[PDB]
Amino acid sequence: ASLIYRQLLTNSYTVDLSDEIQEIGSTKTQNVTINLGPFAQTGYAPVN
Amino acid sequence: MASLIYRQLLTNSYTVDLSDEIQEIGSLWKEMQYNRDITIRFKFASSIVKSGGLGYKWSEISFKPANYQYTYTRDGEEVTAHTTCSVNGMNDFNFNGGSLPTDFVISRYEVIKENSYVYVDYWDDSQAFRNMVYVRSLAANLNSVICTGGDYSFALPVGQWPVMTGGAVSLHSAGVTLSTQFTDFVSLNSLRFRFRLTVEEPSFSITRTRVSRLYGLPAANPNNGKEYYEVAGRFSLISLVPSNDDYQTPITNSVTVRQDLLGELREEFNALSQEIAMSQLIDLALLPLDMFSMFSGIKSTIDAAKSMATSVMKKFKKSGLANSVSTLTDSLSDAASSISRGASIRSVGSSASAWTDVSTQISSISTQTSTISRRLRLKEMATQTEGMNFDDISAAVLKTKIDRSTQISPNTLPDIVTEASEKFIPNRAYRVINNDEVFEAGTDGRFFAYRVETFDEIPFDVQKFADLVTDSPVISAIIDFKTLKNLNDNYGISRQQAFNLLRSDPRVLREFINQDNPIIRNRIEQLIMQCRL
Amino acid sequence: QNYGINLPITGSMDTAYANSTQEETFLTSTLCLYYPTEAATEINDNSWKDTLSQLFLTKGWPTGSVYFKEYTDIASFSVDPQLYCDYNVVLMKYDATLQLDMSELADLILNEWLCNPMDITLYYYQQTDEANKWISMGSSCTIKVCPLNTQTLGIGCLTTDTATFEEVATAEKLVITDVVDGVNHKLDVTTATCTIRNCKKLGPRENVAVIQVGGSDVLDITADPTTAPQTERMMRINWKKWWQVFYTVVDYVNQIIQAMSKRSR
Amino acid sequence: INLPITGSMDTAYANSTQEETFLTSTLCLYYPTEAATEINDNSWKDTLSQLFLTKGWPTGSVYFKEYTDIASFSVDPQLYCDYNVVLMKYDATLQLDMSELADLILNEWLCNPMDITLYYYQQTDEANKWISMGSSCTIKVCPLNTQTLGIGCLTTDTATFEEVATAEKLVITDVVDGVNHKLDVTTATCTIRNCKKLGPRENVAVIQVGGSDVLDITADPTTAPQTERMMRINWKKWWQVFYTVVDYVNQIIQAMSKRSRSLNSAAFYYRI
Amino acid sequence: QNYGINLPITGSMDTAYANSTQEETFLTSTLCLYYPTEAATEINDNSWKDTLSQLFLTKGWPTGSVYFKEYTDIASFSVDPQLYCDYNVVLMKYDATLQLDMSELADLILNEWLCNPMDITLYYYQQTDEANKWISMGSSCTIKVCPLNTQTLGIGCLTTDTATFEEVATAEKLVITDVVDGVNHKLDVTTATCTIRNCKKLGPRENVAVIQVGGSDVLDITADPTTAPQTERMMRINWKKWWQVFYTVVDYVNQIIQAMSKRSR
Amino acid sequence: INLPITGSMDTAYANSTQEETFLTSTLCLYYPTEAATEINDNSWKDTLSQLFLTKGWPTGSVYFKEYTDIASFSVDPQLYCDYNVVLMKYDATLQLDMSELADLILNEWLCNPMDITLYYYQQTDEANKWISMGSSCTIKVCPLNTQTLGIGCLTTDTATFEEVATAEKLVITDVVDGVNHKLDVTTATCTIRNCKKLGPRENVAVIQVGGSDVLDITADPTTAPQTERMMRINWKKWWQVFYTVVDYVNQIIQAMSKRSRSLNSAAFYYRI
């Protein structure tokens, strides 16, 4: 009755294509490069 | 081994669930030689949908399927061809200058990148595209194309124009499948290729905005004024034209098949049953004919080669065999757990054992023996046996018939494998040995107790046969007591040969079958003729 | 599971060496850097903390284990420090004019002190051994001390006239005072701004590690002038930038955590 | 220490460690401003010290630490002495506050910080609670379901959340241990910490000066214990209270014991 | 004479100590000093070299075995130091602002580096051990690094905008960079006026001898911030003139050469 | 090392040193500017790197060091790599130049400086030559006799000296071994060194891209040998030359062997 453990370990490659299924089924979302960076404390010219 | 194949089907049943998931989220013979040349001229389309207001904002710049119909030369004949190009899996960007009505906004516009895939259905009036109804293999080698985006100006009634420019991707051919074009009265069978996209140097940009150095191809002007993009190559295709006595090769493939519907498949099996030999069958009934070796010699069709094992499995786990197995396991579990409120139906033996729980009785000892023997069929594909393991012979007959039988098909082999597994050797006997005392039993309500050395019957000790068959290993009745005693009488037999026949050893079995022993040939022929379907 | 008891232990020498507890102590511990604002200023970036964490991730330290806690100045840090992690690293800038201040900070954090309070206005205090020092933290401490004689009169000072006292600290944020051991002192302290505590020095703290980023090693942990030692968790670098210093810390973190060991207490 | 200890019942009862613990320990009282106000004296501390000096406690061992109010004291109490006594005035309107104070000081907490905005936390066992300190704490919580959505509240509308504390300086919060909560706390004015309750702190001694014994340390309403170091006086003055404390200080220290875990100045341990 | 191989050596403990190879090694070897221009400037003599040579002649070193090789400044010396002699001495002035450069000089000459080239336009480089550093020589090196992740993307930097890179050097004539070992770095360098080389620190060079002339010992040869060692051929002196320094060197040239040992490679 | 080594002929030993270094090799090509000129590409270095990757060499192991001309390369050739390949074009008017370059890089030299003015030097064996490098080296030599006078020349009139180098950058001069010579060299623009030839440098490999084998590495005219690491090619384009080198680099590398004496960057050792 250890055949479950043995077959699970053996057939663990199927999880990869199961993840593939769940991925191609689920939605997608990608992000962009963002900046925190240095930002200058820039005001306006002295106007009249 | 030949029962290991059934055990493996049951084990690998878990793939049927994901196969059905994939299918859901998606939704004599001869050979003819394509590997013909083709040139695919196609193009994209666009779908632009603007919003109201003052005219500064768009709500969609998306792709759209695009047909095309042209003519070209091949092997000296002008052939009229027809393509249909579409895309899938694109990145939807958006630009937004503000919430005011006068700020440039593109709420959504599509761009195809390396994570996208384009499909180009193709068709022409040649002979291949009417002969490709039964395919054995398909694969194509095509050159690549580089498709670049052109200048596109947004019609702003006031101010300066935004200019969409740049952008380019490379299509290389990767993947060929079949498809259909649906006309008004008939249908056309077509061949759709899949090109993968590889981004290239020219970076798309939107002038007078904060968008630049953005690669890909959008839907604004993908063709850059080009009437079409053109790839060129060869497509390799094998056919399964149902030809006949070796002349009159069809054209247009000139056939219908059994899709118009077993009544005659059973007759084919009952014609192929007895032609089977015995020595070679026993040589084949010892081989672990796992999924590959069982499904290799079938010259399948392009869809059956992809789903044959799963196809038979999704029906094999619907049958009396599988349901009885699950019932037995549930009975064992509930017996090991329910003891406090223990199911007290019956126990012919020392203590309660799910293998020895008579039920559904619609002689008493005969009934008990038959009921206990209807679970040794489960012992067979539970690996607690010692001998030729009758399901193994059944599977050998199956593998020896489905390599000859002309009538084998994708919808057809499923539930044939199961009807075989269920109706091959319906009545079958088993034995257990204990201190040189053999207790037999059979599902036909027959029992025989007898000593090994000197075959002479004995009262059948029930409540001991059960205590032994429960835990001790079991053996099969290929050489059952009647024939065994006939043999020991007429064809005088030695101690070792008798022990090996009790253990059902293929060596001694095939040695008798080669010594031409009719008292074994008749029994094996009976087993064959029972493996009839 | 006995607590508060010191029992004899026993072992052997034919016992073999176990495996490397590194690559597990990293995952099951926490690390806290203490950098000066000049570092962030020179760097002129806002993703450098996440960058260093992604680097550490290649050394074994996971994302939510490393922390960077800023301190504007040595003295501001010295004002009531609270180092509560499982591994502390401190990057100390060198300054000749802050030598004793950043020696007292080291003597405070590197070592472990058992502290009782002090009520100047009521009692007259004394030191018993060479470990019972007086540590005063606050915004500006101005301490003065008068030693007394057998009959609780002053010695070169007047118990009444506070100005006759002997000023030992002038407007300091952290003072560690060792005075003559065996006499009763009377103190004047700006208690409105500074809190003073009678603290006995216990064994060292093995959880923190000071790193003098600049000049020669000057830290004199031991108040006594004879020893002037240097321990394993008192490091030194030479610097012209700070990215290089943080890269060095990262690349040789395992050496640092080998030089350090979790706290006994 | 994981090793064992061994002993014998034939050994002798050794001499009294009292009259030496008094010399090598320190004592620290926590009295309210009301007491000094009623007394109207300036040398009462030196008085009490000279009185302790008869009971054995030497001159520079006794300390007095004023606390304006129970809540101001519960805000980050830093008990750093080898023996602590607290005199605590009863008030029905402050019952839960002076019970949370008791649960905080009498016991030994092991605290980790809590980041509300980026993460969400849950309690595991009946000893893992959320304690918040500051000038004005206001805590709202929404428990979530298996699929990360609210339960009778909306993840966005903070008003939908369930208010457990309002305008409190110290709050000890115990929620259903096994669900994920989303919090709303005045982080600018109150810091909150996930603290596990270890064994008790034998170094402090609470003395309720007025009303009956009501403190329910153990949050479960099934023990309602009365520990040894949880005392009660009845008062009409403060001089009689202090004289009583001084005359029965030996019993108090017999009811207390120096800490076992480690040295630390605050009311809890920190482990990040 | 099996070169290119390494074989087990053997000996004994009964053999007697042989004669003093001094008074022969001086004759069959050469000694090169490296002094700063300030020395000859202060001196203002044309025959000081012949003077020191006639003085060495008393210690045993013959006339044409001694060599003097000037250098205007520590950085101009750090720019491609080519030490080709049998015993090298290097007199080094102290400057708290030059500490890192005069420690890099030490880490470069005291040791023996195995240096492979580098090409930044094509490849992205990573370090393998803790002794595989990047040494940059030239007139003004401005080095910037951007570490990459597993999938060839920056960490707090972008692989196009060189301004977002992380700066470790700024117009230095000699630089020695160590980074996190296990991550690929993209580099920006002033290739026109600087050459960078990826070098592995092998065992030390026993052929040179640095003599600091002024301040306290600060040189941290080992890049790791745990050792801070003081090697045997790392000497210190306190100075007010230069003639006294040269007389000291000449009088104690035997201890110097005993601290040094003819090279292996 | 002086000690001996042993062996056998039956064994299959398999026991050998294993260690690490820079990553198991390095390689450096020395190609002429003409090649990149003809190619007119700015990605061919990366192309060749990814090609070599098929032969096994990882990304950061192959390097290219462009050299404008044979003479410019001969002027201080600084090779510091674990394998060096030198593509070299044929020019019948440069035979001596591209044989001196070969005799310099293929062989290992031990060089001492020389002071022309203060001293008069001589050669001892058939391997003690005089190599001069610079921008324009015009050398002149006067042999001398037992009585320190000249022979067909005058110690004063430099015009009487015998000329051996005219407008050469690299010169390898061999003169009669066993007599004192007086030299006149453009010391402002060239440096001359008394060098001794040692065992060969197995780390470099010359590849004559063009005409037949001409390189007489051995100054003696009797040998005229040709070593395993002295290759020839016939060329009409450069892409094909580089593809050939890459397809057959494993044979080049089987012909080259890492150094034995020591590490060094130049083409000769300095020993004063």
Ligand SMILES: *[C@@H]1O[C@H](CO)[C@@H](O)[C@H](O)[C@H]1NC(C)=O
């Ligand atoms: C019947 O089968 C036998 C052997 O199985 C074969 O020889 C014979 O030809 C078959 N009969 C017909 C009519 O084909």
Ligand SMILES: *[C@@H]1O[C@H](CO)[C@@H](O)[C@H](O)[C@H]1NC(C)=O
């Ligand atoms: C023992 O340590 C080595 C070195 O870190 C490691 O590779 C190995 O996995 C360790 N053993 C076990 C059982 O983890």
Ligand SMILES: *[C@@H]1O[C@H](CO)[C@@H](O)[C@H](O)[C@H]1NC(C)=O
């Ligand atoms: C303990 O008390 C007893 C009784 O007063 C006394 O005799 C004994 O001396 C005390 N122990 C010590 C160590 O003095």
Ligand SMILES: *[C@@H]1O[C@H](CO)[C@@H](O)[C@H](O)[C@H]1NC(C)=O
């Ligand atoms: C070794 O030294 C001794 C003592 O100076 C001397 O007598 C002896 O001659 C030396 N050996 C040789 C070989 O000169």
Ligand SMILES: *[C@@H]1O[C@H](CO)[C@@H](O)[C@H](O)[C@H]1NC(C)=O
């Ligand atoms: C090399 O190893 C083999 C097996 O490990 C051994 O038999 C052989 O003796 C070894 N070589 C030598 C020289 O000992």
Ligand SMILES: [Ca+2]
């Ligand atoms: Ca100070």
Ligand SMILES: [Ca+2]
């Ligand atoms: Ca002291």
Ligand SMILES: [Ca+2]
């Ligand atoms: Ca005074």
Ligand SMILES: [Ca+2]
């Ligand atoms: Ca409260």
Ligand SMILES: [Ca+2]
């Ligand atoms: Ca609600």
Ligand SMILES: [Ca+2]
């Ligand atoms: Ca709880």
Ligand SMILES: [Ca+2]
């Ligand atoms: Ca420098």
Ligand SMILES: [Ca+2]
């Ligand atoms: Ca490193």
Ligand SMILES: [Ca+2]
């Ligand atoms: Ca950056």
Ligand SMILES: [Ca+2]
């Ligand atoms: Ca030449």
Ligand SMILES: [Ca+2]
């Ligand atoms: Ca002449």
